[PDB]
Design a protein around this ligand. Structure first.
Ligand SMILES: *[C@@H]1O[C@H](CO)[C@@H](O)[C@H](O)[C@H]1NC(C)=O
Ligand SMILES: *[C@@H]1O[C@H](CO)[C@@H](O)[C@H](O)[C@H]1NC(C)=O
Lengths: 50, 49
């Protein structure tokens, strides 16, 4: 992505900032949420096996 | 070849933010005088009328 000289932050569809400009260096880097997901557990039946 | 404001869309990027902190009610435009105020020419001394 390319930021106009007045632009600092970035956004998508919500309040959370999708991309961001570092104060120390003009380079811009995008942010993605740290991995999440539902741990579903499979089993063949405690009666049958553990 | 458009005398008046053209038909179209152009977005105005921000230029500058001055912390002047003053009160503003009226404004005027500064112009460049190419001709001479002491001696005004009959015509063409200025910029094409
Ligand atoms: C497991 O199920 C079988 C029937 O399919 C039954 O005979 C057995 O007693 C059960 N074992 C336990 C530990 O529940
Ligand atoms: C600015 O000046 C006008 C008078 O011309 C006055 O009515 C107004 O209250 C002033 N505003 C501020 C913010 O000082």
């Amino acid at each position: 992505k390319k930021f106009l000289p007045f632009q600092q932050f970035g956004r998508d569809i919500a309040d959370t900032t999708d991309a961001v400009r570092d104060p120390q260096t003009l380079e811009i880097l995008d942010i993605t949420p740290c991995s999440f997901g539902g741990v579903s557990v499979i089993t063949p039946g405690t009666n049958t096996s553990n | 070849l458009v005398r008046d404001l053209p038909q179209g869309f152009s977005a105005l990027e921000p230029l500058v933010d001055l912390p002047i902190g003053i009160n503003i009610t009226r404004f005027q435009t500064l112009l460049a005088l190419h001709r001479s105020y002491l001696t005004p020419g009959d015509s063409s001394s200025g910029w094409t009328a």
